[PDB]
Amino acid sequence: SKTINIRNANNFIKACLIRLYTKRGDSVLDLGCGKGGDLLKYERAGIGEYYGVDIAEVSINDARVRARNMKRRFKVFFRAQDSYGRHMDLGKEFDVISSQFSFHYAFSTSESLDIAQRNIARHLRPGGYFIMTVPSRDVILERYKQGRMSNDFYKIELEKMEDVPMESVREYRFTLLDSVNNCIEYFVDFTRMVDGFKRLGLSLVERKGFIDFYEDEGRRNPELSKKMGLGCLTREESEVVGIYEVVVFRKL
Numbered sequence: 155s156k157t158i159n160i161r162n163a164n165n166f167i168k169a170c171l172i173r174l175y176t177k178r179g180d181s182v183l184d185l186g187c188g189k190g191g192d193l194l195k196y197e198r199a200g201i202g203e204y205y206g207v208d209i210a211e212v213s214i215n216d217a218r219v220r221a222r223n224m225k226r227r228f229k230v231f232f233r234a235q236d237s238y239g240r241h242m243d244l245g246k247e248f249d250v251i252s253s254q255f256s257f258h259y260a261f262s263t264s265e266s267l268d269i270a271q272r273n274i275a276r277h278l279r280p281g282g283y284f285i286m287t288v289p290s291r292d293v294i295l296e297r298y299k300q301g302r303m304s305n306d307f308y309k310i311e312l313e314k315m316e317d318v319p320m321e322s323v324r325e326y327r328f329t330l331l332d333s334v335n336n337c338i339e340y341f342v343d344f345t346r347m348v349d350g351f352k353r354l355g356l357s358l359v360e361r362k363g364f365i366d367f368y369e370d371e372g373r374r375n376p377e378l379s380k381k382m383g384l385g386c387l388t389r390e391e392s393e394v395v396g397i398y399e400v401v402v403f404r405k406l
């Protein structure tokens with residue numbers, strides 16, 4: 155309830171990102187789909203097929219039930235397995251692969267990233283898109299130097315301290331009110347990701363902050379913002395949102 159505005163913003167930004175790169179009849183691969191909280195959005199986008207994969211079976215179960223009890227016009231496929239740290243082959247390619255708030259979990263180890271990036275590339279049609287919303291390392295480290303790493307909504311803690319380079323930390327503890335609790339998150343090594351994808355044929359095409367994206371997309375057209383309880387984010391709510399950023403790659 156206290157995080158309603160934050161959830162509306164994230165869902166909005168997600169709907170805008172989805173509406174920006176998807177077209178009628180497209181096939182989508184939702185990595186880390188979770189409880190399938192995007193099935194509604196894709197249903198509006200008019201996509202023809204949706205495939206959701208998540209490591210947590212408890213979340214896939216919710217998504218199955220939701221897809222089962224929703225007025226959808228597209229075929230749905232669900233599978234509970236590790237799509238990042240384990241070889242995956244669904245046997246087909248998709249026009250768009252989305253990963254909202256979960257791809258950073260692919261940065262467990264160099265091997266986990268290489269495996270994950272390879273799974274995305276073999277399931278992406280030539281000219282296909284790979285959309286994602288992941289935490290921003292630069293943003294996080296900047297707030298570390300500022301001394302403010304939390305408020306009434308979130309809380310972040312880094313790794314070591316005793317003679318340990320600030321740029322050396324590769325993971326942290328994230329906590330969100332009425333959500334994750336002291337969850338282990340892995341930093342996103344942008345450079346390694348870019349170079350890694352560039353090697354598989356995927357090039358970077360977009361990278362924008364949640365706030366700027368939020369404001370821009372919210373002005374480009376009119377209130378779709380009317381639908382959801384959107385409006386004016388407070389400074390405190392903006393700190394939680396201003397944590398993530400949008401990143402898009404295209405298979406050239």
Ligand SMILES: C[S@@+](CC[C@H](N)C(=O)[O-])C[C@H]1O[C@@H](n2cnc3c(N)ncnc32)[C@H](O)[C@@H]1O
Nearest residue numbers: 186187188208209210236237238254255256259
């Ligand atoms: C914040 S939740 C996603 C919620 C949903 N995507 C959305 O945008 O509302 C992150 C998800 O990442 C998934 N995840 C974490 N590690 C994963 C892995 N190795 N393979 C697949 N999914 C993974 C979890 O099971 C969790 O449901």
